[PDB]
Amino acid sequence: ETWWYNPSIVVHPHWREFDQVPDAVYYSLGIFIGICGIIGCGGNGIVIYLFTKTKSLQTPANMFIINLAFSDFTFSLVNGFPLMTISCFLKKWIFGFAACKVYGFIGGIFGFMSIMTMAMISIDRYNVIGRPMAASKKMSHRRAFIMIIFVWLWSVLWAIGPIFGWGAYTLEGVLCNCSFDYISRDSTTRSNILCMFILGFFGPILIIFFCYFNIVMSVSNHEKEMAAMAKRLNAKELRKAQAGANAEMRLAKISIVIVSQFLLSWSPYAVVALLAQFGPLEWVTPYAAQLPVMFAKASAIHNPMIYSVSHPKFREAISQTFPWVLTCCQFDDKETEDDKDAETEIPAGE
Ligand SMILES: CCCCCCCCCCCCCCCCCCCCCC
Ligand SMILES: *C/C=C(C)/C=C\C=C(C)\C=C\C1=C(C)CCCC1(C)C
Ligand SMILES: CCCCCCCCO[C@@H]1O[C@H](CO)[C@@H](O)[C@H](O)[C@H]1O
Ligand SMILES: *C(=O)CCCCCCCCCCCCCCC
């Protein structure tokens, strides 16, 4: 009788008025997300493997990186193959409502986790680079551990609403993947959406900007300070300190690129969602929602590749364990120099 009917999940009327997209579109969608599964799990596994097992990458802050990779790993796993990919190739979600909920809930829980983890990373950056060199503070296992616990609690908190009725996780677009309900406009649903956007999204964003804008409005605070201590009879041993700042600065830069990646990846879909909940629902067509959600879903497969082209210690490790990966991005000793000096201690004024 219809092309959208699902015996397990009640498709919102809105998605029911559209014609069924062509086979080639379903197939491309499945192939697409399936490849995010491979790259995502592949790349994130490597970071988790390399970071937990390399000695040069054993600092507390790096735990955030690992946490982020676990987050992105699980997103790519659960959101790609086989729940969506298989659904596409059959032009239908055959895994039942429970799976849909788990799917949507997992997607949200780790989407909220990736930015909040980045937030914790932006904080570490502020303590090592944002504050003055005299008050510079490095991340400690204690702190770090407590921070991720906050991250996990936070992430689950703002994504579990629909699990208990305060919102919902159902099919969207071509009906082969799940997400929260941004169509229904009842008090309940709308409050959960507002909570997701404000608490889950805008929240960590503020922390981010407050930390990076704080690192920018301190580049000069540091610019002067560097000199004051420089001519402070500080010998050639001043170079050491300088290298350290460069090394840290580079990582801070990295942090920003992965954050930019996240935002550029999710903001579109976020917007289309808001239109569906506050604007012209007639705009939210099958592709209007689908295409932007795919872009969002792939977000979880970018950090590893970003790291592989700009992270020295990490690039080192790769060259030493899975060198084929760095083919087009060949590693060199000179990439780790700044880390060498930054750590090479001075023997009693040398
Ligand atoms: C049904 C036909 C299937 C053909 C499959 C051909 C696939 C061979 C793929 C080789 C892929 C290795 C991928 C795992 C590595 C993840 C890539 C991410 C790069 C991360 C860098 C940090
Ligand atoms: C493909 C499956 C998905 C997108 C499942 C669930 C997604 C959410 C609960 C997303 C929430 C949001 C995030 C992570 C960041 C941008 C804004 C947002 C509220 C749409
Ligand atoms: C991109 C994510 C940035 C994570 C920053 C990890 C912070 C680890 O920064 C590390 O601090 C060590 C001193 O404790 C230095 O020896 C390392 O070179 C430096 O990379
Ligand atoms: C060096 O660090 C590069 C590592 C190689 C990572 C593999 C990247 C393959 C992903 C292909 C992306 C295709 C999308 C098309 C974009 C224009």
Distance in angstroms (rounded) separating the CA atoms of residues 317 and 259: 23
Contact call for residues 303 and 256 (beta carbons, < 8 A): no
Please give the tally of structural domains in the chain: 1
Alpha helices (H) in the chain, listed in sequence order: 13-16, 23-53, 62-79, 83-89, 96-125, 141-159, 187-195, 203-216, 219-230, 238-278, 286-298, 303-310, 312-321, 337-343
Matching residue, tokens 């677009």: 173
Ligand 2 pocket member 293 (CB < 6 A): yes
Experimental method reported for this structure? X-ray
Nearest CA to ligand 2 atom 10: 108
Asked if residues 129 and 245 have their Cβ atoms less than 8 Å apart, the reply is: yes
CA of 62 to the centre of ligand 3 (A): 7
Q: Is the dihedral of CA 149, 151, 157, 159 positive or negative?
A: negative
What is the resolution in angstroms?
2.5
Residue 305 and residue 47 in contact, taking contact as beta carbons nearer than 8 Å: no
Radius of gyration of the chain (CA): 23
The 10 Å CB-count burial string (b at 16+, else e) for 136-156 is eeebeeebbeebbeebbebbe
Domain around 296: 2-350
> Distance from first CA to last CA of the chain, Å, rounded?
84
Secondary structure in 3-state letters for 13-62:
HHHHCCCCCCHHHHHHHHHHHHHHHHHHHHHHHHHHHHHHHCCCCCCCCH
- How many angstroms does the Cα of residue 248 sit away from the middle of ligand 2? 31
Query: Is there an atom of ligand 2 within 6 Å of 200 CB?
Result: yes
Residue pair 254/311 in contact by the 8 Å Cβ criterion: yes
Q: What is the rounded distance in angstroms from the CA atom of residue 67 to the CA atom of residue 314?
A: 16
Residue 35 CA to ligand 2 centre (angstroms):
20
Cα(302) to centroid(ligand 1), Å: 14
The DSSP 8-state label assigned to residue 244 in this structure reads: H
Q: Atom 7 of ligand 2 has which residue's CA nearest to it?
A: 108
The maximal CA–CA distance of the chain, rounded, in angstroms, is 85
Residues with CB under 6 A from ligand 1: 38-39, 42-43, 46, 304-305, 308, 325
CA distance 288 to 50: 39
Neighbouring C-beta atoms of residue 323, cutoff 10 Å: 11
What CATH number does the domain containing 35 carry? 1.20.1070.10
Give the position of tokens 């990736």: 114
Task: Answer yes or no: are the C-beta atoms of 331 and 315 closer than 8 Å.
Answer: yes
- Cα 26 to averaged position of ligand 4 atoms, centre (Å): 23
CA 260 remoteness from chain centre:
10
Contact predicate 221/129, CB 8 Å: no
Distance CA 48, CA 265 (A): 22
Sequence-distant (6+) residues with CB within 8 A of 51 are 57, 62, 65, 66, 69, 314
